[PDB]
Coordinates of C-alpha atoms in Angstrom, one line a residue:
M1 CA 121.7 -45.1 -11.1
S2 CA 120.2 -48.6 -11.5
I3 CA 121.9 -51.9 -10.8
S4 CA 124.2 -53.0 -13.7
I5 CA 125.3 -56.6 -14.3
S6 CA 128.2 -57.8 -16.4
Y7 CA 128.3 -61.5 -17.3
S8 CA 130.3 -63.9 -19.4
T9 CA 128.2 -65.4 -22.3
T10 CA 128.8 -68.8 -20.6
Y11 CA 126.0 -67.9 -18.2
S12 CA 123.6 -66.4 -20.7
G13 CA 120.9 -69.0 -19.8
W14 CA 121.6 -69.2 -16.1
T15 CA 119.5 -67.4 -13.5
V16 CA 121.2 -65.0 -11.0
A17 CA 120.1 -67.1 -8.0
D18 CA 121.5 -70.2 -9.6
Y19 CA 124.8 -68.5 -10.3
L20 CA 125.1 -67.0 -6.8
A21 CA 124.2 -70.3 -5.1
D22 CA 126.6 -72.2 -7.3
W23 CA 129.6 -69.8 -7.0
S24 CA 129.0 -69.7 -3.2
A25 CA 129.1 -73.5 -3.0
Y26 CA 132.4 -73.5 -5.0
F27 CA 134.0 -70.7 -3.0
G28 CA 132.8 -72.4 0.2
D29 CA 133.6 -71.2 3.7
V30 CA 137.1 -69.8 4.5
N31 CA 136.3 -70.1 8.2
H32 CA 137.2 -66.4 9.0
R33 CA 135.7 -66.6 12.5
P34 CA 136.7 -65.9 16.1
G35 CA 139.5 -68.2 17.1
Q36 CA 140.1 -69.3 13.4
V37 CA 142.1 -66.4 11.9
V38 CA 145.8 -67.1 12.8
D39 CA 147.7 -66.7 9.5
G40 CA 147.3 -65.4 6.0
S41 CA 145.2 -68.3 4.6
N42 CA 141.8 -66.8 5.1
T43 CA 142.2 -63.0 5.7
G44 CA 141.8 -61.6 2.2
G45 CA 143.3 -58.2 1.6
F46 CA 142.5 -54.5 0.9
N47 CA 143.7 -52.3 -1.9
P48 CA 145.5 -50.1 -1.0
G49 CA 145.0 -51.4 2.6
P50 CA 146.0 -52.3 5.1
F51 CA 142.5 -51.9 6.7
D52 CA 140.7 -49.8 4.1
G53 CA 140.4 -49.6 0.4
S54 CA 138.6 -49.2 -2.9
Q55 CA 138.6 -53.0 -3.0
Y56 CA 138.5 -56.0 -0.5
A57 CA 139.3 -59.3 -2.2
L58 CA 139.4 -62.9 -1.0
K59 CA 140.4 -66.2 -2.6
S60 CA 138.8 -69.5 -1.6
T61 CA 140.7 -72.1 0.4
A62 CA 138.6 -74.8 -1.2
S63 CA 139.0 -73.9 -4.9
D64 CA 140.3 -71.1 -7.2
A65 CA 137.1 -69.1 -6.8
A66 CA 137.4 -65.6 -5.6
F67 CA 135.5 -62.3 -5.2
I68 CA 136.3 -58.6 -5.2
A69 CA 134.1 -56.1 -3.3
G70 CA 134.5 -52.6 -4.7
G71 CA 133.6 -49.2 -3.2
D72 CA 134.9 -47.3 -0.3
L73 CA 135.4 -49.9 2.4
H74 CA 136.7 -49.9 5.9
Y75 CA 137.6 -52.6 8.5
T76 CA 137.4 -51.7 12.2
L77 CA 139.8 -54.6 13.2
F78 CA 139.9 -54.5 17.0
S79 CA 138.0 -51.2 17.4
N80 CA 134.4 -50.9 18.7
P81 CA 132.4 -52.2 16.9
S82 CA 135.1 -54.7 16.3
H83 CA 135.6 -56.7 13.1
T84 CA 133.1 -54.6 11.1
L85 CA 133.4 -54.2 7.3
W86 CA 131.5 -51.0 6.5
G87 CA 131.3 -48.0 4.1
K88 CA 130.2 -47.9 0.5
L89 CA 129.8 -51.2 -1.4
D90 CA 129.3 -50.3 -5.1
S91 CA 130.2 -53.7 -6.7
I92 CA 130.7 -57.4 -6.2
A93 CA 132.8 -59.2 -8.9
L94 CA 132.7 -63.0 -8.9
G95 CA 134.9 -65.5 -10.7
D96 CA 138.1 -67.5 -10.5
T97 CA 141.9 -66.8 -10.3
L98 CA 142.4 -63.7 -8.2
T99 CA 145.4 -61.7 -9.3
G100 CA 147.1 -58.5 -8.2
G101 CA 146.4 -56.7 -4.9
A102 CA 147.7 -53.5 -3.3
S103 CA 151.3 -54.0 -4.7
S104 CA 149.8 -54.0 -8.3
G105 CA 147.4 -51.1 -7.5
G106 CA 144.4 -53.3 -7.8
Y107 CA 142.9 -56.7 -7.7
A108 CA 141.4 -58.4 -10.7
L109 CA 140.0 -61.8 -11.6
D110 CA 141.7 -63.6 -14.5
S111 CA 138.4 -65.3 -15.2
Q112 CA 135.7 -62.7 -14.2
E113 CA 132.4 -64.4 -14.6
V114 CA 129.7 -62.1 -13.2
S115 CA 129.7 -58.6 -11.6
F116 CA 127.0 -56.7 -9.9
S117 CA 127.6 -52.9 -9.9
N118 CA 125.8 -49.8 -8.9
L119 CA 124.7 -51.6 -5.7
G120 CA 124.4 -48.2 -3.9
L121 CA 124.9 -49.9 -0.5
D122 CA 126.2 -47.7 2.2
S123 CA 126.5 -49.0 5.8
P124 CA 127.6 -46.7 8.6
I125 CA 130.0 -47.9 11.3
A126 CA 127.4 -47.7 14.0
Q127 CA 125.4 -50.6 12.5
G128 CA 128.4 -52.8 13.2
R129 CA 128.2 -56.4 11.9
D130 CA 124.4 -56.0 11.4
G131 CA 125.2 -53.6 8.5
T132 CA 124.1 -54.7 5.1
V133 CA 127.6 -54.2 3.6
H134 CA 129.0 -56.4 6.4
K135 CA 126.3 -59.1 6.0
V136 CA 126.7 -59.2 2.2
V137 CA 130.5 -59.5 2.2
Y138 CA 130.8 -61.8 5.2
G139 CA 128.1 -64.0 3.7
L140 CA 130.3 -64.5 0.6
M141 CA 133.3 -65.2 2.9
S142 CA 131.3 -67.8 4.9
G143 CA 129.5 -69.8 2.1
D144 CA 126.2 -68.0 2.3
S145 CA 125.2 -65.7 -0.6
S146 CA 121.7 -65.1 0.8
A147 CA 122.4 -61.5 1.8
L148 CA 123.8 -60.6 -1.6
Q149 CA 120.8 -62.4 -3.3
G150 CA 118.4 -60.4 -1.2
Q151 CA 120.0 -57.1 -2.2
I152 CA 120.2 -57.9 -5.9
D153 CA 116.6 -59.0 -5.9
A154 CA 115.4 -55.7 -4.3
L155 CA 117.6 -53.6 -6.7
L156 CA 116.3 -55.5 -9.8
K157 CA 112.7 -55.0 -8.7
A158 CA 113.3 -51.2 -8.1
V159 CA 114.3 -50.8 -11.8
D160 CA 112.0 -53.3 -13.5
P161 CA 109.4 -55.3 -11.4
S162 CA 109.6 -58.2 -14.0
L163 CA 113.2 -59.0 -13.0
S164 CA 114.4 -61.0 -10.0
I165 CA 117.2 -63.4 -9.0
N166 CA 115.3 -66.1 -11.0
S167 CA 115.6 -64.1 -14.2
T168 CA 118.3 -65.3 -16.7
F169 CA 121.3 -63.1 -17.5
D170 CA 120.1 -62.7 -21.1
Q171 CA 116.7 -61.7 -19.8
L172 CA 118.4 -59.0 -17.7
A173 CA 120.3 -57.9 -20.7
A174 CA 117.2 -57.7 -22.8
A175 CA 115.6 -55.6 -20.1
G176 CA 118.5 -53.1 -20.2
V177 CA 120.2 -53.8 -16.8
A178 CA 122.9 -56.2 -18.0
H179 CA 125.5 -56.8 -20.7
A180 CA 127.3 -59.9 -21.9
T181 CA 131.1 -60.1 -22.2
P182 CA 133.0 -62.5 -24.5
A183 CA 133.6 -65.9 -22.8
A184 CA 136.3 -67.0 -25.3

């Protein structure tokens, strides 16, 4: 099935590209890199975990921004190809105020702003950190939404060539690929 987007009415007049560039600036870069992951501050977590789940979620260290990647996700940790997030990425949910986790049976955003679902992304372990799933999620972890933007743009054009990341959320809803949720 086609990409589906859920958005708070707050962003009715925003474009997707604008929202993704903005959220990524707010979330910033958690600096989850070689030599820089030494404690719990920038790891994120899996549900149920510890290294696999229906969700991977991460809160910013520069704001209350957070994201939840949904699907059937796996982290290789030390194992060849090391430090690869792979599997099925069905959704990316973006917003503020991450809640829950494995001990609650699920992550949720208290202020979920925009979600992209039916992404249909499936990256095998053999692609390693060159896999699209890895690049999309690691991009969000590291202050660069470009990979996600590229995938959303391709998915939108597959369903309706008039839509792109420069379309407004209300434009996407008019076209039948998005739906607004109450802001207040």
